[PDB]
Amino acid sequence: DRLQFRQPSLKRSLMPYFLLTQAVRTGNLAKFNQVLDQFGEKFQADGTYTLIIRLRHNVIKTGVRMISLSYSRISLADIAQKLQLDSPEDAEFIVAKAIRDGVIEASINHEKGYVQSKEMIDIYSTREPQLAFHQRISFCLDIHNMSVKAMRFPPKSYNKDL
Amino acid sequence: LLKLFTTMELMRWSTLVEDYGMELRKGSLESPATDVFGSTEEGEKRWKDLKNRVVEHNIRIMAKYYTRITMKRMAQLLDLSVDESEAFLSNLVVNKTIFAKVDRLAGIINFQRPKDPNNLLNDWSQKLNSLMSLVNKTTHLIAKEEMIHNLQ
Amino acid sequence: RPANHRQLTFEEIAKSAKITVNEVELLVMKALSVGLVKGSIDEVDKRVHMTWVQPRVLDLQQIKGMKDRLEFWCTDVKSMEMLVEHQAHDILT
Amino acid sequence: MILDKKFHGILDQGEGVLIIFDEPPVDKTYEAALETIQNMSKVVDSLYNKAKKLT
Amino acid sequence: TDYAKKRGWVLGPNNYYSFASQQQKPEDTTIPSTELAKQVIEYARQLEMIV
Amino acid sequence: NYNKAVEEEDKMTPEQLAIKNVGKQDPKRHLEEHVDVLMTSNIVQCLAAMLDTVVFK
Amino acid sequence: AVQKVVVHPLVLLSVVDHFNRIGKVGNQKRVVGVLLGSWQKKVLDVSNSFAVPFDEDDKDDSVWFLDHDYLENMYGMFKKVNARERIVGWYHTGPKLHKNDIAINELMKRYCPNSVLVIIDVKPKDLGLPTEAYISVEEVHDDGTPTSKTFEHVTSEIGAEEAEEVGVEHLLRDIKDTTVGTLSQRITNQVHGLKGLNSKLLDIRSYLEKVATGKLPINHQIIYQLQDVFNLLPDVSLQEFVKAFYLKTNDQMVVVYLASLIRSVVALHNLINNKIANRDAEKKEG
């Protein structure tokens, strides 16, 4: 949200947007679908409802991304009911639509029918670090060293007149 | 004495049974073995302390080697219980086994594989390996280069 | 085997020696007891990893492999020296 | 006494496993991070001189 | 039918099998040490070219 | 430690530069020493590639 | 017995004198000078020397000509001016160890103590160190070959005491000193692979020639330790040394933050003075 900048222009700018942008994370379908168009005046009068109409079915994808930030196994009552999505097929199906993204880490397994995931969010700390911040070293040193060029040449632009 | 000297192969003390037994029987030499067993309890303390002392000593010998004789197998080759091997470990914690690795999962132990600091340990191995390769590479190089001078 | 999984196992040793697996620990303890080898094996499940021993006799295949890895090492060090040195001398000298 | 950090260890309830480890190189990230934070006021006070002198 | 000639995979005992999945052996670190050495060359360059 | 131990001195300097700006009174320069500190610090960089060559062949 | 020697550059400059006082004859043999030094400490320390007229034959190697009277007179007058140094050994400036050099050496093994031999080069085109200390010792051989005088290399360093540094450094004005940083590091880091390259390539090619075309005990035994230690580096798998590269790479990251941060601090006076000097000299210029 607006965290580190305090000015009452962006504040009034998000004064309509706040209820829906807090309504992103909990992601309740039937309520927030009414909430958007309900007081929708200027953000839905801003034109052609495009990225909010992508938002309307991005709700369950960001919510199931919070499920990816939650535990591994997918239940048929608890988390399927919790995602307002009550069937064996659509659970593994739309979770599988998050699997075909590649943004996650998951293990499609059927032993008894329950779907696993290894859900490993382990960072590269003791996991191939040299190759990992290898590119960070090269890019960062190039930025810092072209900044070294940016403190070489403007002193040339200082001593040029004299 | 030479069996107690160094590099002790893990040997059977039943082979020492006839040695100490006839070492009591013969009066040709070392007659006060019956004086070693002179007191009712003292020679027994020397004996259990003796088997104890060698059965700790050889562990200190194979403890030099990192060859991992896998003490669950060793307790089977020794024909002794693992519970008195836990007693042996009670003699090892006071005998400073404190640099070692035990297992909750296995019973196999490791006397090595430290945390291994690469700025210390693999530093040191890389140092003496690289440098000894360089300077040992240096000497017989020019030395054989002097040896081929004499063929002319 | 000079390289490519220097690590080996007891099955070739005991197959070489027609000996049981109960005695191979005594065999490697004796081999370390002579002192011609320094190899200490960090295995749990049984393995034979080795270090230094002395060739001491002759091997013409190690004369030729000596020339092979020796010449290979020479053209690799030459290759890296030319490789660094080509752009390196032109920018640093 | 792990929470008072008298020694190195961490426990377990499912497995009952003890693990003992340590971190010797403490003085690198200290001097690094404090060098960053002390250079913050250098750059920001520089921007106060330059934001003074331009606008 | 089509996917046996399209995928060209193994068809097991009433199961669909997945191979070549996260099987890769990691690098030797030698070639990236050479390109890191080239990075050191270009650090001597970019640090010291005009000098 | 010498770097940060100068940075505690350069912490006070932008007040002085924020007051006077006319004439220089300190013979201590704080720059070229730290350039030298970087030059000694770049031995790590120059010898890292040396380690790469020894590790290579 | 003796681990290392110290040879001062004065005697090698007197080998420049060996190549000066020739007089252009067409001989230019391995002219022997009488090496002087300090055998007193366990380290050998060469201070100075002189030379003696030495002749061999064209065909015969074993004809060789020295002088005892010239040795005792030059060494006598030298000991009269400086008795803190004594006779120690000798040297020939030829690149090659002749068969005769055991017998030429034997004269100074007799009258002097155990004498050291130095092989140096007539033309200093060798990138390597020109001086090699060869201890004159008889060593017992494992093959059963009879014991003979054997020249084992004793490692050497070339150092100057005090004033030789000053005079040499005044004469050059071309060499640069230690000078840690970019240049003196990076030049060793330029030619360094060439320095092991010409060593190894200079050795293994004619060595490989003496493999197939060689006999007469080339120390065939030291090939086993040689190739053995060469096979003590069997192209390491780096798997444990990965974390070592995290270590040197993390020290590298420390040099990143130091270089970036400290150079960014050097940017301060630059990006202040660039404005405040120019615009004020401009606005008070008119």
Curated annotation (Swiss-Prot), chain B:
The modification N6-acetyllysine is found at K64. Residues 1-116 form the PCI domain. It comes from the Eukaryota. It is linked to Stankiewicz-Isidor syndrome: A neurodevelopmental disorder characterized by delayed psychomotor development, intellectual disability, behavioral disorders, mild dysmorphism, ophthalmologic anomalies, feeding difficulties, deafness, and variable congenital malformations of the cardiac and/or urogenital systems. Belongs to the proteasome subunit p55 family. Component of the 26S proteasome, a multiprotein complex involved in the ATP-dependent degradation of ubiquitinated proteins. This complex plays a key role in the maintenance of protein homeostasis by removing misfolded or damaged proteins, which could impair cellular functions, and by removing proteins whose functions are no longer required. Therefore, the proteasome participates in numerous cellular processes, including cell cycle progression, apoptosis, or DNA damage repair. Component of the 19S proteasome regulatory particle complex. The 26S proteasome consists of a 20S core particle (CP) and two 19S regulatory subunits (RP). The regulatory particle is made of a lid composed of 9 subunits including PSMD12, a base containing 6 ATPases and few additional components. Interacts with ERCC6. This is 26S proteasome non-ATPase regulatory subunit 12.
Swiss-Prot record, chain C:
The modification N6-acetyllysine is found at K15. Disulfide bonds: none annotated. It comes from the Eukaryota. Belongs to the proteasome subunit S11 family. Component of the 19S proteasome regulatory particle complex. The 26S proteasome consists of a 20S core particle (CP) and two 19S regulatory subunits (RP). The regulatory particle is made of a lid composed of 9 subunits including PSMD13, a base containing 6 ATPases and few additional components. Component of the 26S proteasome, a multiprotein complex involved in the ATP-dependent degradation of ubiquitinated proteins. This complex plays a key role in the maintenance of protein homeostasis by removing misfolded or damaged proteins, which could impair cellular functions, and by removing proteins whose functions are no longer required. Therefore, the proteasome participates in numerous cellular processes, including cell cycle progression, apoptosis, or DNA damage repair. This is 26S proteasome non-ATPase regulatory subunit 13. It comes from Homo sapiens.
Curated annotation (Swiss-Prot), chain D:
Induction: By FOXO4; expression in embryonic stem cells (ESCs) is mediated by FOXO4. Transmembrane segments: none annotated. It comes from the Eukaryota. Phosphorylated by AMPK. Component of the 26S proteasome, a multiprotein complex involved in the ATP-dependent degradation of ubiquitinated proteins. This complex plays a key role in the maintenance of protein homeostasis by removing misfolded or damaged proteins, which could impair cellular functions, and by removing proteins whose functions are no longer required. Therefore, the proteasome participates in numerous cellular processes, including cell cycle progression, apoptosis, or DNA damage repair. In the complex, PSMD11 is required for proteasome assembly. Component of the 19S proteasome regulatory particle complex. The 26S proteasome consists of a 20S core particle (CP) and two 19S regulatory subunits (RP). The regulatory particle is made of a lid composed of 9 subunits including PSMD11, a base containing 6 ATPases and few additional components. Belongs to the proteasome subunit S9 family. This is 26S proteasome non-ATPase regulatory subunit 11. It comes from Homo sapiens (Human). The chain holds residues 368 to 422 of 422 of the full protein.
Curated annotation (Swiss-Prot), chain E:
It comes from the Eukaryota. Coiled coil: none annotated. Component of the 19S proteasome regulatory particle complex. The 26S proteasome consists of a 20S core particle (CP) and two 19S regulatory subunits (RP). The regulatory particle is made of a lid composed of 9 subunits including PSMD8, a base containing 6 ATPases and few additional components. Interacts with DDI2. Interacts with TASOR. Component of the 26S proteasome, a multiprotein complex involved in the ATP-dependent degradation of ubiquitinated proteins. This complex plays a key role in the maintenance of protein homeostasis by removing misfolded or damaged proteins, which could impair cellular functions, and by removing proteins whose functions are no longer required. Therefore, the proteasome participates in numerous cellular processes, including cell cycle progression, apoptosis, or DNA damage repair. Belongs to the proteasome subunit S14 family. This is 26S proteasome non-ATPase regulatory subunit 8. It comes from Homo sapiens (Human). The lineage of its organism: Eukaryota, Metazoa, Chordata, Craniata, Vertebrata. The chain holds residues 300 to 350 of 350 of the full protein.
